[PDB]
């Protein structure tokens with residue numbers, strides 16, 4: 096079941112990438128860079144999850160799905176870039192604020208991988224550093240980045256706020272599931288955690304980019 | 317023999333880098349970035365192949381030898397080669413960084429699929445191999461499609477030089493997956509020693525040769 | 540003692556990052572990018588050294604201890620330090636990103652050669668070590684040659700500050716390969732505990748100290 100679910104994930108990621116490619120042919124005032132980012136995220140995630148389907152992306156008395164971290168270390172910074180470029184749509188880019196989010200995010204993902212390889216108290220030291228990183232990313236998202244979106248007009252700011260809430264809501268689920276599942280307290284079963292880390296990324300990657308790009312295309316008229 | 321051939325490779329790469337450094341002192345209207353890229357490619361490749369000569373850049377997986385240092389080489393050197401090609405098409409005009417980074421993304425994936433294919437057994441090997449080939453096909457479509465159209469927009473002389481260098485690179489690049497498949501990593505029709513000679517001779521033309529043809533053409537547009 | 544010293548290091552790095560964050564709120568004409576670089580360096584180094592304190596960032600290779608977390612630290616922190624230096628020379632003038640990326644390329648290679656040297660036995664160790672030293676020499680040539688000439692082109696006050704920071708960095712940086720060679724990784728004339736103290740004290744001056752001297756100088760060109 097685990098293998099079949101991961102094949103199904105990869106196929107949906109492929110269809111997502113094709114959809115974003117088609118949209119890019121009629122860009123409706125959205126820069127090509129934003130279409131490219133929306134295509135890379137699902138293609139990279141699909142390839143990583145494919146490695147799990149074929150039984151290569153994990154190792155073993157607990158099973159670590161390391162391919163998830165290889166996915167997230169590329170896909171999550173690109174998602175924060177898409178969010179930041181949304182706030183900055185039609186105005187000056189602030190690359191310092193963008194790269195601050197990339198730096199925080201990559202650290203967050205590495206702390207999670209190390210936490211998964213750790214035993215005892217040490218696991219929860221690393222986990223905690225990752226959570227603090229996520230908190231600061233959320234403060235930036237709803238503080239200075241939202242202020243940039245407001246400075247680009249009410250229509251843009253409204254779309255930014257919607258996409259920020261969408262992403263923020265899905266992102267807090269990852270560390271929660273991690274903690275309740277085998278990697279943490281083990282209150283939830285392996286099969287449960289797998290279903291969560293199949294369904295969340297579908298909404299997190301393909302869903303987010305549909306909502307994000309349609310909103311920006313609608314500002315062309 | 318295998319060790320000595322890799323020492324010889326590294327020494328030729330060093331001489332290549334020194335030659336490009338000298339050329340950079342009299343740049344003849346070619347930006348410094350293009351000289352830097354031409355120097356990094358052979359220096360990085362030389363260091364990787366040196367690790368093979370010293371017997372560090374390989375290990376034994378079941379009954380086969382994996383030359384993993386090749387992948388450490390190619391993951392840096394091949395994206396820089398596609399950048400040099402893209403900057404050639406864009407010479408005297410606006411840079412399109414989105415198209416450049418699309419080629420880098422495709423290329424890095426292509427090289428990773430090859431490394432994983434080399435570590436795989438049975439059908440799984442050929443799934444990864446196949447994904448890498450599709451990546452290479454899309455790179456070739458970009459090279460002869462949108463990137464060639466950018467070269468045309470920068471004038472007849474430049475477009476002619478671009479087309480020559482693109483064919484040169486395209487011809488050498490299709491040899492890598494072919495050799496991979498016929499050698500030990502694939503069907504095993506060719507011996508280890510054969511594959512080694514191929515992955516010594518091809519990179520010399522692919523790295524140092526390509527950059528000589530590429531840079532001399534661009535320097536000739538100054539006069 | 541080794542574990543306690545690494546906790547103390549991480550805590551000092553945290554306080555360094557906080558100080559640079561406060562300074563960034565009243566930037567005094569220094570771009571936000573230079574404050575961000577000064578914050579990333581100590582935070583990344585602190586996290587790496589924390590992994591040593593918890594006993595995860597090292598392993599036993601043959602009969603010696605490799606502190607591999609140091610290399611994970613330096614491969615991110617040292618290129619960012621050379622970037623801060625380069626941006627100091629270029630303060631109030633055109634950025635030369637080709638010269639900046641040349642320093643990053645040299646530096647990353649230098650750090651990788653060190654990691655491979657630490658994993659090597661016999662002559663091979665000293666081949667890799669030597670390639671890293673040559674990289675450091677070329678970085679020093681750039682620092683006191685073309686990069687210092689850019690600083691002079693941005694005026695006497697800036698050039699004076701650049702020269703001070705360049706000497707400060709150059710002085711600390713030559714200590715790393717010296718200590719490496721005298722300690723367990725090399726000839727073994729110095730004890731593990733000695734080497735540890737050196738690779739706790741030097742980075743404090745190398746990271747937090749350098750950025751204090753660097754940023755205060757640039758802020759003073761505003762007053």
Ligand SMILES: CCCCCCCC/C=C/CCCCCCCC(=O)O
Nearest residue numbers: 189190191194198201202572579615
């Ligand atoms: C923690 C893991 C590694 C993270 C490294 C990320 C690098 C951080 C530094 C980036 C510099 C940002 C450059 C921005 C330039 C434009 C400045 C602006 O106009 O805002």
Ligand SMILES: CCCCCCCC/C=C/CCCCCCCC(=O)O
Nearest residue numbers: 128135411412413414417421424425
């Ligand atoms: C498989 C791993 C891939 C990692 C690299 C992914 C890169 C994606 C990001 C693209 C950045 C595009 C730069 C945009 C610059 C706009 C100006 C222009 O295009 O001329």
Ligand SMILES: CCCCCCCC/C=C/CCCCCCCC(=O)O
Nearest residue numbers: 349356634635636637640644647648
């Ligand atoms: C050993 C690993 C090497 C990885 C780093 C690769 C460095 C090569 C890239 C060069 C980019 C050049 C910078 C762009 C030039 C902009 C114009 C300018 O200001 O000079």
